[PDB]
RNA sequence: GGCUCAGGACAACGGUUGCACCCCCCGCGGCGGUCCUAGCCGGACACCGCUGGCAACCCGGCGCCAAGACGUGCGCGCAAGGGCGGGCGCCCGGGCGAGCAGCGUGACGCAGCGACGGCCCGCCCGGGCUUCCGGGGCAUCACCCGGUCGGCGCGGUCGCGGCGCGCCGAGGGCCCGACGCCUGGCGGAGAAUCAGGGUUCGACUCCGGAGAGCGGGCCUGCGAGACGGCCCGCACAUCCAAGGACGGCAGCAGGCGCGGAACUUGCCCAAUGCGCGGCGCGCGAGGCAGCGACGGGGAGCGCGCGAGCGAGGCGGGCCCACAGCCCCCGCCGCGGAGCCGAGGGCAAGCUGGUGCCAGCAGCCGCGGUAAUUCCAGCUCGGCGAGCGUCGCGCG
């Protein structure tokens, strides 16, 4: 089936190497999970029997995740609203597909329920008084079956704000 | 490429220092995994059948072992392919024979008979220190044994004395210049000498220079240098004291024995 | 040929009987019925009138059994997994493709398996005997929880040599003692490890340590 | 384990590194704390009984019963993953050459073990990839490559990686022979030949690789893209009571075809080992026997003026899993040499025929009336249980 063996490629000179054996099971790959944001329907996670009896779980649908505000040391479980930016391609954004590095909007309730009363960074607080907070994804859905991340801070926040503001 | 692990062993592909006849058969015993590896071990049946001669076939050895007639480090072993290695204790109470497995100068395994006072322990080489679960310090040895909570004063390549009945450390010998050692690998297996120099190369092997009692000097890598005491051996050693004669003297000895 | 051997089985008394049918027109009402479907016995009025029957299985004229959810009047092939019906496996992951008759009933059948669920008051040629006795402790205790004695009966059945099934799930001295010894061993092991940790920590007063602090 | 060498020419393979980018059954040694009826839990199937279909292969329905089988699960917080936690030019413990491991703490999630206690860690064998060097011929193949070269990001993988996808840039190789084509191309340890330097070969005993009619796909499992495992297409082949069913000797014997060329459809696990297992079973692996002028080694067809010894036969031992064979002991006692040549190279010559005919002759040459060379007899020479002819390699 799908394989990642290098025998089917060309050489550094651009030559055809040739083939000397049939396909092997060590060098196989699998179809992508394509984890979807929920926005019969519910959280669905599958399990994969990998080499050595090891277990791998890929998420197909999920709606929640753990997010951390590093500067203030605040962490809660929050609901993810939608994906708003992705560097690889805009098609993933349109489909609300979750991958590592996606930029998402989370609900503000778990944070505002305790914030807006202590001196901290102005920008995060302005986000808090609203409905959503900009954030990022740091885990790998499709390998561990989870979608965690962290709240954006300084220069990267400015970068992404300037990116998505005109839209 | 074989689809799995290997279970057989051709006789011609067996280690040389086992001394197996070419015409004995197509096959040789395949040792099972255990305290020692394939190339640093010798199966029990070879000792029990081709040396001591208490058995003449595989079957007799099987009966003897399954009747519990040999103890290895205080534990009865019923496997004819169990691996025996260096500085192991071989006791047969039915005949009051006790042997310690060591190396001869020629580079082969030999049985040195011992006493009762020194058969309650063995020497082990520590070559790995690591943190296990929960950050608990650990320590491993050449015979595939691990000990938890070792003394901080014990470092790598040191030598450790452990009681056979209880795997508890008593005293330890450091790896240092001026300590008697015994070579356990390569061209110089079975030689005994004292460390004179230590030279390290970043990212490569560390070479140890040793001098024999007679003034001969030889070199070997640190991976097969075993400490056996502080200037004097801690255990009984073969009749010869780790002296390898030259071909001329060996020929003279052969002619004398002829 | 043109016929169908109907086999009737009685689960309440464990009696089974078979009969012969040489017609289809009388049995047209049997056509179009699926497995696990009530089938009034009026088709065979004499001796089987006023009785409700359920269709359980059958075999077509070539011998192919009938599968469940096929929903067809004709046999077909499918890949059968291990542990499914009408397939005896050889290895532990082997599959096999074979032909099976469709669940829907039709003239093509040569056999029928049916059961009696509700009947009238009339007697029919078609009590349940028992060939074996319950073996687990719970079963026999039910038929002559938290039962301290754990004793039991032994009258059983005799055939001369007396033969009775051995009782299972019974705890006496050996099992109780074994469990208690195992518990004591585990407690001793935990205590020894804790003591070793404590003395190691007491040592190293002149150095640093890192271990997983026990929470709770 | 056993068979074979089709395919594959910066590959496989050989030596030398590495994983601080990895996985691993048995075995050995440790470790063993589990959030929210425990005198012992629940329901089934197999074998089996009754009733049945079909030519065969194959199975159906009903029914009581077991588990070191399946499910649930008694318990001192514990799987994967995720955020935060070092410096001020550099260097001078858990551990390294190397900031690598572990731990704490804020949030998520309740994975595995537990109705006779094993989740986890280390070692070991094995595997996967990877650095450096070596790794066929043709220039009547001189320019080649376009995921081809690199970068960023995600995905997938046991895992690194153009391995795959999106975007960006343009690159990479070449007379120190690229690219293409051919091979009656598996590689090495090694074999033949013989002053020294070398030439040719390397199916086959050990190691490594690849395959099981061709081409693909997959389940089980630590481990197979396995074929004495399953699914499909193609090419073949088989049984059918014509609706259906079924197969893969490059495993051991045996058969057809092909070819210049190649053996018994034998007996046994007693030995060496492997699998399971306590006083053992099985194994066409392997061993024993049979055919066998591939070939290698050792004796002999006489010595002597009479004695002696072989082969061979009839019996007894030894050996053997059973039997042969060798060897030993007794009574009778089958003594058999061919293949080449006799002008030179090259050691070895006498009559009768034929008449440039028939024929010899590796080369030179003979034969048209003595033929020292043809065909025959005598004699002689070489090697010898072996001799000669054909093809190939070395010399
Ligand atoms: Mg609980
Ligand atoms: Mg259970
Ligand atoms: Mg070929
Ligand atoms: Mg091979
Ligand atoms: Mg294969
Ligand atoms: Mg296959
Ligand atoms: Mg076959
Ligand atoms: Mg096979």
Q: How far is CA A46 from the centre of its chain?
A: 17
In this complex, the chains that touch B, judged by 3 or more CB pairs closer than 8 A, are C
Nearest ligand to the CA of B13 is: 4
How far is the alpha carbon of C188 from chain B, nearest alpha carbon, in Å? 17
Task: Indicate yes or no: strand D within 7 A of the C-beta of C205.
Answer: no
Reading across the β-sheet that carries C111-119, which strands appear in turn? C15-21, C4-10, C111-119, C51-57, C38-40
CA of residue C93 to ligand 6 center, whole Å: 16
How far is the alpha carbon of C212 from chain B, nearest alpha carbon, in Å? 5
Interface contact B166, partner C, CB < 8 A: no
Residues B164 and B120 sit within 8 Å (Cβ to Cβ): yes
B70, B71, B72, B76, B164 from B89: Cα distances, Å: 10, 8, 6, 12, 9
Through-space distance between the first and last CA atoms of chain A, rounded to whole angstroms: 42
| Best to test chain C binding among B133, B135, B136 (most C CBs inside 10 Å) | B136
Residues of B whose CB is below 8 A from C204: 152
The torsion angle over the Cα atoms of residues B68, B73, B75 and B81, rounded to 10 degrees, is -60
Q: What are the start-end ranges of the E strands in chain C?
A: 4-10, 15-21, 38-40, 51-57, 76-80, 96-100, 111-119, 157-158, 162-163
Task: Indicate yes or no: strand D within 7 A of the C-beta of C181.
Answer: no
Task: Indicate yes or no: strand D within 7 A of the C-beta of B30.
Answer: yes
- Are B102 and B8 contained in the same domain? yes
Distance B7 CA to D268 C1' (A): 25
Which nucleotide's C1' atom has the smallest distance to the CA of B157?
Answer: D95
Residues C96 and C80 sit within 8 Å (Cβ to Cβ): yes
Through-space distance between the first and last CA atoms of chain B, rounded to whole angstroms: 50
CA of residue A50 to ligand 6 center, whole Å: 21
- Are B190 and B156 contained in the same domain? no
Distance C201 CA to D347 C1' (A): 104
Pairing, β A132-137 against β B71-72: unpaired
Residues B20 and B27 sit within 8 Å (Cβ to Cβ): no
Residue B239 within a domain:
yes
- Are B10 and B101 contained in the same domain? yes
Distance C211 CA to D94 C1' (A): 12
Question: Do B149 and C200 count as a contact with CB atoms less than 8 A apart?
Answer: yes
- Are B34 and B112 contained in the same domain? yes
Token readout for C136 is: 């687990």
Distance C186 CA to D113 C1' (A): 14
Spatial CA neighbour of B18 closest among B54, B56, B44: B44
Q: What whole-number distance in Å separates Cα of residue B84 and Cα of residue B109?
A: 10
- Residue B135's SS3 state is helix
Residue B195 within a domain:
yes
How far is the alpha carbon of C169 from chain B, nearest alpha carbon, in Å? 34
Which own/partner contact pairs does A119-126 have at CB distance under 8 Å and 24+ positions apart? A120/A71, A120/A72, A121/A71, A121/A72, A121/A153, A123/A157, A124/A69, A124/A71, A124/A72, A124/A151
Residue B257 within a domain:
no
Number of domains in chain B: 3
- Are B25 and B62 contained in the same domain? yes
Question: Do B135 and C210 count as a contact with CB atoms less than 8 A apart?
Answer: yes
Spatial CA neighbour of C42 closest among C55, C56, C54, C26: C26
Pairing, β B71-72 against β B88-92: antiparallel
Task: Indicate yes or no: strand D within 7 A of the C-beta of C93.
Answer: yes
- Are B105 and B9 contained in the same domain? yes
Distance B173 CA to D302 C1' (A): 83
Token readout for C175 is: 């099992």
Residues A90 and A119 sit within 8 Å (Cβ to Cβ): no
Interface contact B258, partner C, CB < 8 A: no
Spatial CA neighbour of C65 closest among C53, C78, C81: C78
Task: Indicate yes or no: strand D within 7 A of the C-beta of C25.
Answer: no
Q: What are the start-end ranges of the E strands in C58-153?
A: 76-80, 96-100, 111-119
Token readout for A70 is: 């590093």
Through-space distance between the first and last CA atoms of chain C, rounded to whole angstroms: 79
Q: What whole-number distance in Å separates Cα of residue B194 and Cα of residue B209?
A: 9
CA of residue A23 to ligand 5 center, whole Å: 11
- Residue B193's SS3 state is strand
Range(s) of the domain holding residue B160: 122-172
Q: What is chain A written as a DSSP string?
A: --B--GGGSB-TTS-B----S---STTB-------EE----S-EEEEEE-GGG-EEEEEEEE-EEEEEETTTTEEEEEEEEEEEE-SS-HHHHHHTB--TT-EEEEESHHHHTT-SSS---HHHHHHHTSSEEEEEE-S-TTTSS---EEE--SHHHHHHHHHHS--
Q: What is A72-102 written as a DSSP string?
A: TTEEEEEEEEEEEE-SS-HHHHHHTB--TT-
Task: Indicate yes or no: strand D within 7 A of the C-beta of C84.
Answer: no
Are 3 or more Cβ–Cβ pairs between C and A shorter than 8 Å?
no
Pairing, β B159-163 against β B169-173: antiparallel
Residue of C nearest to B132 (CA): C211
Which nucleotide's C1' atom has the smallest distance to the CA of A52?
Answer: D222
Which nucleotide's C1' atom has the smallest distance to the CA of A91?
Answer: D166
Phi and psi at B4, nearest 5°, equal -160, -165
- Are B92 and B132 contained in the same domain? no
Q: Is C92 part of any known ligand binding site? A: yes
Residue B255 within a domain:
no
- Are B166 and B179 contained in the same domain? no
Token readout for B78 is: 């019923």
Which nucleotide's C1' atom has the smallest distance to the CA of B57?
Answer: D271
B4 CB-near residues (< 8 Å, 6+ apart): none
Residues C10 and C16 sit within 8 Å (Cβ to Cβ): yes
Q: What whole-number distance in Å separates Cα of residue A48 and Cα of residue A55?
A: 6
- What method was applied to determine this entry? cryo-EM
Interface contact B130, partner C, CB < 8 A: no
- Are B113 and B129 contained in the same domain? no
Task: Indicate yes or no: strand D within 7 A of the C-beta of A36.
Answer: no
- Are B108 and B136 contained in the same domain? no
């008084």: which residue's tokens?
A129
Token readout for A114 is: 């305790």
Residue B215 within a domain:
yes
Phi and psi at B5, nearest 5°, equal -70, 165
How long a stretch of residues is chain B? 258
Distance C99 CA to D246 C1' (A): 15
- Are B223 and B164 contained in the same domain? no
B142: left (phi over 0), alpha (psi -120 to 50) or beta: alpha
Interface contact B203, partner C, CB < 8 A: no
Residues of B whose CB is below 8 A from C211: 134-136
Phi and psi at A128, nearest 5°, equal -65, -45
In this complex, the chains that touch A, judged by 3 or more CB pairs closer than 8 A, are none
Spatial CA neighbour of B33 closest among B84, B83, B87: B83
- Are B14 and B80 contained in the same domain? yes
| Best to test chain B binding among C196, C204, C211 (most B CBs inside 10 Å) | C211
Q: How far is CA A41 from the centre of its chain?
A: 20
Interface contact B6, partner C, CB < 8 A: no
How far is the alpha carbon of C181 from chain B, nearest alpha carbon, in Å? 23
Residue B100 within a domain:
yes
Identify the domain boundary among B109, B137, B172. Answer: B172
Which nucleotide's C1' atom has the smallest distance to the CA of A57?
Answer: D80
How long a stretch of residues is chain C? 216
Q: What whole-number distance in Å separates Cα of residue B159 and Cα of residue B190?
A: 17
Question: Do B134 and C204 count as a contact with CB atoms less than 8 A apart?
Answer: no
How far is the alpha carbon of B135 from chain C, nearest alpha carbon, in Å? 5
């Amino acid at each position: 089936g799908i394989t990642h063996d290098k025998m089917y490629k060309r050489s550094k000179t651009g030559a055809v190497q040739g083939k000397w054996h049939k396909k092997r099971k060590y060098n196989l790959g699998r179809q992508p999970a394509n984890t979807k944001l929920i926005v019969n329907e519910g959280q669905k996670i599958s399990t994969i029997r990998c080499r050595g009896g090891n277990i791998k779980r890929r998420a197909l649908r999920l709606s929640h995740g753990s997010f951390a505000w590093g500067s203030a040391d605040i962490s809660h479980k929050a609901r993810i609203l939608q994906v708003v930016y992705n560097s690889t391609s805009n098609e993933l954004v349109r489909t609300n597909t979750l991958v590592k590095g996606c930029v998402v909007q989370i609900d503000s309730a778990p944070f505002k329920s305790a914030l807006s009363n202590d001196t901290l960074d102005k920008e995060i607080l302005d986000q808090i008084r609203g409905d959503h907070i900009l954030a990022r994804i740091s885990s790998r859905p499709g390998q561990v079956g989870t979608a965690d991340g962290y709240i954006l801070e300084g220069p990267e926040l400015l970068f992404y704000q300037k990116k998505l503001a005109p839209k | 490429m074989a689809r799995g692990v290997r279970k057989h062993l051709k006789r011609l592909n067996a280690p040389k220092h086992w001394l197996l006849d070419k015409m004995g058969g197509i096959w040789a015993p395949r040792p099972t995994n255990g305290p020692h590896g394939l190339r640093e071990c010798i199966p029990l049946i070879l000792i029990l059948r081709n040396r001591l001669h208490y058995a003449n076939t595989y079957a007799e050895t099987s009966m003897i072992l399954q009747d519990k007639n040999v103890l290895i480090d205080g534990k009865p072993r019923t496997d004819p392919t169990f691996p025996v290695g260096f500085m192991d204790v071989f006791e047969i109470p039915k005949v009051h024979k006790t042997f310690r497995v060591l190396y001869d100068v020629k580079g082969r395994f030999t049985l040195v008979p011992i006493q009762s006072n020194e058969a309650g322990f063995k020497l082990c080489r520590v070559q790995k220190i690591f943190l296990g679960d929960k950050g608990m310090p650990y320590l491993s040895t050449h015979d595939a044994r691990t000990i938890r909570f070792p003394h901080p004063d014990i470092k790598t390549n040191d030598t450790i004395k452990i009681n056979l009945k209880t795997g508890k450390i008593d005293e330890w010998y450091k790896f240092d210049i001026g300590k008697i050692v015994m070579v356990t690998g390569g061209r110089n297996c079975g030689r005994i000498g004292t460390i004179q120099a230590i030279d390290k190369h970043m990212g490569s092997y560390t070479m140890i220079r040793m001098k024999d009692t007679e003034g001969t000097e030889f070199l070997t890598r640190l991976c097969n240098v075993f400490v056996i005491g502080n200037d004097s051996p801690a255990v009984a050693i073969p009749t010869t004291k780790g002296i390898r004669p030259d071909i001329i003297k060996n020929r003279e000895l052969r002619l004398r024995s002829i | 040929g043109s016929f169908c051997k109907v086999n009737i089985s009685n689960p309440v008394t464990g009696a089974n009987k078979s009969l012969m049918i040489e017609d289809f027109r009388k049995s047209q009402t049997i056509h179009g019925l699926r497995m696990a479907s009530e089938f009034d016995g009026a088709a065979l009025g004499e001796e089987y009138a006023g009785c409700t029957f359920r269709i359980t299985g059958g075999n077509d004229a070539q011998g192919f059994p009938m599968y469940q959810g096929v929903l067809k009047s004709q046999r077909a092939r499918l890949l059968l997994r291990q542990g499914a019906k009408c397939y005896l496996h050889r290895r532990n992951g082997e599959r096999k493709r074979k032909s099976i008759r469709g669940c829907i009933v039709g003239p093509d059948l040569h056999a029928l398996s049916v059961v009696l669920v509700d009947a009238g008051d009339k007697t029919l040629p078609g009590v349940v005997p028992k060939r074996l006795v319950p073996k687990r402790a719970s079963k026999i205790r039910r038929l002559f929880t938290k039962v301290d004695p754990k004793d039991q009966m032994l009258v059983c059945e005799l055939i001369k040599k007396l033969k009775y099934p051995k009782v299972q799930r019974v705890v006496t001295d050996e099992k109780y003692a074994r469990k208690q010894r195992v518990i004591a061993e585990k407690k001793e092991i935990m205590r020894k490890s804790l003591q070793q940790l404590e003395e190691y920590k007491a040592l190293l007063s002149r150095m640093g340590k890192q271990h997983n602090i026990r929470i709770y």
